[PDB]
């Protein structure tokens, strides 16, 4: 019955608009689907972005001169608000256009019929919550291992297993497997479910929470958790839904070795630096090699025809000496995921996975020839080796 007119500071407007517009479709079926919906009421502005997969909705304080709603191009609104001066932005809908004024700059954009915009899915009931910094760390640690190939949809997900206060997060691309276990504040003590969430989207949400309020995850409560096929994520006046992957995930737990023929602990920062250096000659081979024995490891790469590189590094070693090779990117991805001063490697053979886990600088994980039991940990990065040359 009335046209929308509101006013608010550029920065508040730009941040909300950007977050909402980013999950809009690449090739919108109809012009309406490229739009973001602005709704002003009372003392607040809602910004809504619908997409089949991911729908996002931000709420910010605003001066509402006149209530109403309007549908405008998401990408254009985002670009404009990002580029404006840090002055108040006036938005006024007249008929089929919306005027956006900021200082001496004036924009006039075409609007689209709000009646044609799909309804955003309702968030499921809250399942639990956790600190933003924990959400950011755990998702960052696991997402690095997720597949990026849509021909294998199951691998593009992060597996989320909930059992009361405990959450287990897992991802793999067939070459590395990352698993993080954490504690959170569960809505119900007897909640129990397992779902599969598109990794790329989840990772973006975890990063965007950084610095923010507690993060609420909404999958439902009791027995009906997961039944809606949606994951809700909310905090900071922002709420989104992500359509779950309806695909079977591999049984990963049976891969985690419980004992090792050799165990090695090293300094993470020094190993990452050394890998970066020797890998400069490994463009063709896509491997670095490690020759472990008591006290030391030879890290090397390359070949006669392209050039060779080597560095010896200190190791706290126990068990059988071992020569083993790795993809250097997959190896430094895992080392970067530990978030600890030191790393423990758990080995069996040169053709079987290596278990990387975090070790503090105040710890020192030995007697005998082996084998050595695996030390309990809340994070693992399990990395397949590659075949050695010859």
């Amino acid at each position: 019955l009335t046209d929308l007119t509101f006013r608010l500071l550029r920065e508040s407007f730009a941040d909300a608009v950007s977050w909402v517009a980013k999950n809009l479709p690449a090739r919108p079926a109809v012009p309406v689907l490229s739009g973001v919906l602005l709704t002003g009421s009372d003392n607040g502005l809602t910004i809504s972005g619908f997409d089949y997969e991911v729908s996002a909705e931000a709420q910010v304080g605003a001066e509402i001169v006149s209530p109403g709603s309007v549908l405008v191009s998401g990408r254009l609104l985002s670009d404009i608000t990002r580029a404006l001066p840090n002055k108040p932005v006036d938005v006024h809908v007249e008929g089929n256009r919306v005027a956006l004024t900021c200082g001496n700059a004036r924009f006039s954009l075409p609007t689209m019929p709000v009646e044609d915009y799909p309804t955003l899915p309702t968030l499921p009931e809250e399942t639990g919550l956790l600190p933003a910094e924990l959400f950011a760390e755990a998702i960052s640690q696991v997402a690095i291992a997720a597949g990026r190939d849509d021909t294998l949809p199951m691998l593009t997900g992060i597996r989320v297993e909930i059992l009361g206060e405990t959450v287990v997060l897992a991802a793999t691309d067939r070459f590395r497997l990352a698993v993080r276990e954490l504690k959170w504040s569960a809505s119900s003590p007897d909640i129990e479910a397992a779902v599969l969430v598109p990794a790329k989207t989840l990772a973006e949400a975890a990063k965007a929470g950084i610095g923010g309020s507690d993060v609420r995850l909404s999958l439902g409560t009791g027995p009906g958790v997961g039944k809606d096929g949606l994951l809700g994520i909310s905090g900071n006046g922002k709420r989104s839904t992500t359509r779950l992957l309806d695909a079977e995930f591999p049984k990963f737990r049976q891969l985690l070795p419980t004992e090792h023929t050799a165990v090695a602990t090293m300094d993470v920062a020094e190993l990452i630096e050394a890998i970066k250096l020797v890998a400069l000659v490994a463009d063709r081979g896509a491997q670095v090699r490690m020759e472990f024995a008591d006290g030391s490891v030879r890290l090397s790469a390359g070949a006669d025809d392209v050039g060779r590189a080597e560095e010896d590094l200190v190791v706290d070693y126990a068990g059988e000496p071992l020569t083993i090779a790795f993809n250097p990117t997959y190896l430094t991805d895992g080392l970067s995921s530990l978030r600890s001063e030191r790393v423990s490697f758990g080995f069996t053979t040169a053709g079987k996975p290596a278990l990387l886990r975090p070790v503090s600088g105040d710890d020192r994980p030995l007697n005998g020839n082996g084998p050595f039991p695996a030390v309990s940990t809340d994070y693992v990065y399990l990395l397949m080796p590659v075949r050695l040359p010859g």
């Binding site: 793999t172 067939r174 497997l177 591999p250 049976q254 053709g351 996975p353």
Partner: peptide, 10 residues
Amino acid sequence: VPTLPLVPXG
């Protein structure tokens, strides 16, 4: 370049 022995998956 072998895969992790995932079942299924390799």
